[PDB]
C-alpha cells in the first residue's frame, strides 16, 4: 500500500475525521504527550495524506483548545493533560475568539 | 482515458472514494492536484482518489 | 527502511550526508520546509520527526539535537546554515536549558 498525496486539513476533513477517532473510541480520555500527538499526525499523514501541520493546540496552562475549526479535540488537564472530545468546537472557534495571534 | 485501481482504498472523509483494486473509474478532474475527483464506473458515485492509487487501462 | 532512534551518531552521518549533497545550505527557512525535512528524512531514514528542533529567536536558531550540525541564521528572514562545531559546543543548550 502505497502513501497517498498530499493536501491540507480542512474543517469538513477534519469534522469526518473527529467523529471518525470518536466513534472509534480511544483517543477519548487519552493523557497527552508531544510523543504521541505525533503519532497521531503521522497516523493520519499516512493513511489519509492530510500534512501534519493541522493538531496544534493554543498554549496553556489549563485547556488546549485546538487551532484547526473543525478537529472537536482539545487538550484537557486531568500540567498533565488528556484529549477530550467536544462537538462545540466545531460551532466555535474558540482557539481564535482567544489567541488571535494565530489567525 | 479511464483508469483502474491498483491498490485497494478506505476513504475516512465523506468526499473521498472506497475502492478495490481493479474497481475502474473515468476522471472528471485531474488538473487541481495529485487527489482526482473520479467517477466509479461500478457504482456512480463520484469523490476524491489518490492518483498515485490508479494507473490508465 | 525501518524505524530508529536519533543518535548523535545518526545526527552527525545525517549533516555530513546533507552538506555533501548541497542544497539544505544557504536554503531560506519556513515551517512548512522543515516540514518536508522531517518527512523526508522519515520515509528514507527512518527517524522519528521529533529530532529538527531549533531555539526561540530572535537572533540565530541553534538545534536542540547535538549533533545535527545546522542552525537557523538571519539574513526575520532565516536560511539553513552548516557549522561543524555545533557537533562539539551544544550551544543550544548553554542558552536554552529549558528545553533539557
Known amino acids: ?103 | 482515458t479511464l483508469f483502474v485501481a491498483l491498490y485497494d482504498y478506505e476513504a475516512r472523509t465523506e468526499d473521498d472514494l472506497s475502492f478495490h483494486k481493479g474497481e475502474k473509474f473515468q476522471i472528471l478532474n485531474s488538473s487541481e492536484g495529485d487527489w482526482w475527483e473520479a467517477r466509479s464506473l461500478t457504482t456512480g458515485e463520484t469523490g476524491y482518489i489518490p492518483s498515485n492509487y490508479v494507473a490508465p487501462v
Open chain 1, 1 to 103: 500500500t502505497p502513501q497517498v498525496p498530499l493536501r491540507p486539513m480542512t474543517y469538513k476533513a477534519a469534522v469526518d475525521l473527529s467523529h471518525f477517532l470518536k466513534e472509534k473510541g480511544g483517543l477519548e480520555g487519552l493523557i497527552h504527550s508531544q510523543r504521541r500527538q505525533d503519532i497521531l499526525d503521522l497516523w493520519i499523514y499516512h493513511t489519509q495524506g492530510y500534512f501534519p501541520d493541522w493538531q496544534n493546540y493554543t498554549p496553556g496552562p489549563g485547556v488546549r483548545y485546538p487551532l484547526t475549526f473543525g478537529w472537536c479535540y482539545k487538550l484537557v488537564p486531568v500540567e498533565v493533560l488528556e484529549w477530550r472530545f467536544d462537538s462545540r468546537l466545531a460551532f466555535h472557534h474558540v482557539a481564535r475568539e482567544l489567541h488571535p495571534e494565530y489567525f
